[PDB]
Design a protein around this ligand. Structure first.
Ligand SMILES: CCCc1cc(C2CCCCC2)c[nH]c1=O
Ligand SMILES: CCCc1cc(C2CCCCC2)c[nH]c1=O
Ligand SMILES: CCCc1cc(C2CCCCC2)c[nH]c1=O
Ligand SMILES: CCCc1cc(C2CCCCC2)c[nH]c1=O
Lengths: 546, 546
């Protein structure tokens, strides 16, 4: 019975294979068939290619030896290699054209999700080319989805030598009969088969995956669309910045490129962006996923005033100052969305671009006020319930698991009767004691939020709603301004509080505003529709944020 | 008696002044004298410029109002503005040409070092231009050297209104007679003077600084060359990555740009790079200053094998993997220098560029060994003393303050008799009980190292020297390779162990090797000659690391 799956890289997890380029170059340059492939394998286990694959020499040392083999082969074949013949150019192109075989990676992901130990076993080189970063990125994206990466040049052994197969089994801590091994080179399957492993000669992916599901008894083909990569809290880089004597800000950090600062809403965490973090880092951005003031590992002072928008914005500016960042793109959701618009209004020099999920840009009415406005719309009643210190805290802190299970639900699954929260005396007066698990969350993800809120609870988070008169006065100073920096507004169809129609007048204040819209999406945007959120943000980032 | 110094920005801390561009544009376009300056100030306190300076409107909203004032002024003067006349182009250029007035900044730095409270008081705008980042960077570099930054557009008040002066005094918590105020606009000095503050009308910097030193009694002019900006540990962003179950790695992070991973030697800290960190971040790099395994906030496992080069390198690769970095430039000193060369030899795909301070590239002799080689050269005797577990630990841990005071000394100041460490039974057998403070370090910097080594001591750090046979075997696998990625070797004249002549054969292994060399520089390169280290690294980074 199988418990391990091993994948080759070239021709299996990455396509097109580099071996197929040697053939394509012969045909294009009308060279004798197999001349390039023969110079490549010249001298078998004694040759330059084996020394390269074993880690004896680097790719740049190998290039001239391949040229000499190419010359030797052309001489024997009584032919002449062209004028502009360059091994470097051929291999540079081949490596750059090679992409992840997404359906093969998904099958490996599905196998690992069902309890399989997964590994990449590859014959590779030590790449010292000026352009090595391309391959370095490919190996990075790939390796993180597997338990083991075994590279010939790092282990000093090569496929098809029997030693590498014994090394593989040892690494996996599995007997040969419990291993499926997938390779596009028949010669490399032979020793795995001889040892008793299940082998699959990979020609086209579909057939290979049909064999893979037949042998494992797990559906890998015709599978529903997978969710994006999520985050394991313990595998992230955690950062800590003191912004003032009693205030430290915590964040999770992933990627290189322009800085993208993610700002969650109420009552959330950096972990609310778990499905965006690997995606935005992969798209070429440096992600800074915040624990906002009052949350997780960030400080949670008890004073209401500590959570007014002016103080919160000033602290985010200091946060940039202490990290040495002149700008960041600011992306917010719910309360984080309100803050990002105010970051754009008050500090446009520090904001590369601004995007909000659900939260429209709410300009202060100097004639009315937020209190009067909140009373006018029954959907905002819960904000009045949040006013009196202690009341909402007691209900939200009573049973943490019930709190997040009741809150973190899709539009259909909801248990909250938003209209009369004050009258009924609570958000969960009609919610069960043991809510069911929403289709959006696992038990483990709920438990991460539970552990996070054990430190400071709901005082600091609730205080974000207790600064209406303070925020209104501060906002009124911006009544003559406009947002003229790149901006994105993302509406959610089924958000019953932050309704799409609430954003209809935003172009008056933000004339160059770009939009995004997600159908069948509730309040918890990032986890409700992760794939579509990622697609909207990546498209807007690449076009408007550089 | 003075205790506060206030500086204006345009024409004082930054040059050339933007007001001087309006005059230069009139002369270049042969326009009537003062036309551009008059359209700029049109309507005084009621005008568009005042609304901009108070934060009522953004720079992009102001541009069209300035054009209309320019039209109105040209009409009255019975003249015509040119065809290609654009306020945006003029201001874009003016802002970009404006640089920090380095001698004025040094005087502010010297005043702050002597106990003065320093502030920037400026009439500025909310910059929403596509090119705002330039100014955002200037304000960033500048603000960090002052206690306060007061911006008109953020306080809704403007110079010369008396309210801003009362706001300034309140912020400073100082009476007017204790304040020096420097401005290039006579009209803006007037209210400060009226209140009783010492004022300086800044025309040329030299004269202004002569007045400033005459009034404060502190030497600001003709001062010795200042050291680069250092780091305050509590103001840095601290990062933590788990690289394996029992190993977490700590680092300090500053800047945006290509990742630059700094690797200290023995017995050091991330803080050994304190003079390089602000400099390299300012030069356009993302600095990652490590606490290497066994040091500071990084884990310190007790087992010798945990500190062999193979394990240490694998962990640095995982460190990159967990941060989502495909590459970093690796810069090392002493033991960190040895590791960076091995990172280049074994993982060239993950290394953008490699630089070493003092440590040459030491290729294994398959015929000899490191033990035999270490015995052959008496300067390396201390490494034999480091072999026996517990012995070096007892001496180094006995009195931490004495340890770092005895070690961290320039070549002349040294108290160690390196030749016979074993024979004499210790590194400090001829060092005083209370060593004097070296010219390179303050009491506070020594105390930071003391507090750092209180956590794990010298076991983990000493174990880096206890892997000779393990490192030799691993290194022998690389005997056929070459380092062909961008590489820099920096030698130190007065290092008595890692002597410059030890690097003389490096070109055999690294043919494209670039070099740097520092005269009158001992073992502690980074703190001995910080200005020259910064100059060598920045020059090589900008030319070879992108
Ligand atoms: C700057 C506005 C201040 C503010 C607005 C709101 C609401 C008002 C109704 C529309 C959505 C935001 C809640 N809390 C606040 O502090
Ligand atoms: C139907 C209830 C779901 C919902 C809740 C909220 C609030 C409720 C209290 C916490 C903040 C989100 C906003 N929008 C919604 O659609
Ligand atoms: C890879 C070499 C291993 C090694 C060398 C040295 C010395 C040998 C003499 C020259 C400088 C480095 C000290 N410790 C080691 O583990
Ligand atoms: C003259 C002694 C100064 C000195 C010490 C060291 C060692 C001594 C033990 C700790 C590591 C550095 C290397 N090079 C030098 O010039």
């Amino acid at each position: 019975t199988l418990r391990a799956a091993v994948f080759d890289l070239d021709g299996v997890l990455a396509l097109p294979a580099v071996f197929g380029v040697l053939g394509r170059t012969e045909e294009a340059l009308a060279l004798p068939r197999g001349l390039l492939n023969d110079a490549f394998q010249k001298g078998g286990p004694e040759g330059a290619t084996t020394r390269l694959m074993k880690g004896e020499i680097t790719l740049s040392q190998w290039i001239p030896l391949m040229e000499e083999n190419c010359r030797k082969c052309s001489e024997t074949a009584k032919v002449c290699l062209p004028k502009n013949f360059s091994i470097k150019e051929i291999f540079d192109k081949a490596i750059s054209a090679r992409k992840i075989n997404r359906p093969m990676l998904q099958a490996a992901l599905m196998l690992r999700k069902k309890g399989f130990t997964t590994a990449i076993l590859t014959n590779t080189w030590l790449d010292d080319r000026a352009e090595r970063d391309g391959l370095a990125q490919l190996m990075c994206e790939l390796k993180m989805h597997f338990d083991f990466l075994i590279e010939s040049c790092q282990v000093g052994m090569v496929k098809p030598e029997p030693q590498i197969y014994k090394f593989l089994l040892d690494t996996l801590k599995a007997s040969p009969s419990e291993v499926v091994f997938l390779d596009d080179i028949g010669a490399n399957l032979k020793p795995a088969r001889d040892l008793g492993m299940v082998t699959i000669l990979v020609q086209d992916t579909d057939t290979a995956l049909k064999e893979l599901e037949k042998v494992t008894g797990i559906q890998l083909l015709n599978t529903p669309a997978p969710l994006p990569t999520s985050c394991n809290p313990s595998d992230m880089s955690h950062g800590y910045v003191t912004v003032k004597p009693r205030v430290r800000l915590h964040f999770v950090e992933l990627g290189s490129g322009p800085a993208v600062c993610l700002c969650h809403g109420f009552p959330e965490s950096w972990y609310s962006w778990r499905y965006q973090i690997p995606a935005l880092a992969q798209a070429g951005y440096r992600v800074l996923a915040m624990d906002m003031k009052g949350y997780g590992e960030s400080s949670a002072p008890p004073e209401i005033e500590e959570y007014c928008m002016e103080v919160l914005c000033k602290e985010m500016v200091t946060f940039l100052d202490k990290l040495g960042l002149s700008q960041a793109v600011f992306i917010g959701h719910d309360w984080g969305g309100m803050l990002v618009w105010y970051m754009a209004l008050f500090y446009p020099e520090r904001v590369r671009a601004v995007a909000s999920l659900n939260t429209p840009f709410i300009p202060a009415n100097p004639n009315m006020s937020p209190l009067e406005s909140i009373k006018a719309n029954p959907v905002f009643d819960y904000q009045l319930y949040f006013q009196e210190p202690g009341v909402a805290e007691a209900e939200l802190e009573q049973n943490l698991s019930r709190t997040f299970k009741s809150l973190f639900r899709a539009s259909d699954e909801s248990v909250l009767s938003m209209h009369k929260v004050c009258e009924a005396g609570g958000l969960f007066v009609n919610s069960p004691e043991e809510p069911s698990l929403s289709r959006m969350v696992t038990e483990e993800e709920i438990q991460f939020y539970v552990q996070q809120f054990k430190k400071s609870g709901f005082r600091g988070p609730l205080n974000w709603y207790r600064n209406m008169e303070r925020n209104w006065k501060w906002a009124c100073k911006s009544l003559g301004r406009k947002i003229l920096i790149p901006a994105l507004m993302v509406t959610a169809e089924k958000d019953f509080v932050l309704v799409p129609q609430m954003s209809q007048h935003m172009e008056d204040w933000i004339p160059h505003l770009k939009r995004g819209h997600i159908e069948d999406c509730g309040h918890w945007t990032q986890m409700d529709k992760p794939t579509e959120v990622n697609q909207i943000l990546i498209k807007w980032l690449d076009s408007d944020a550089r």
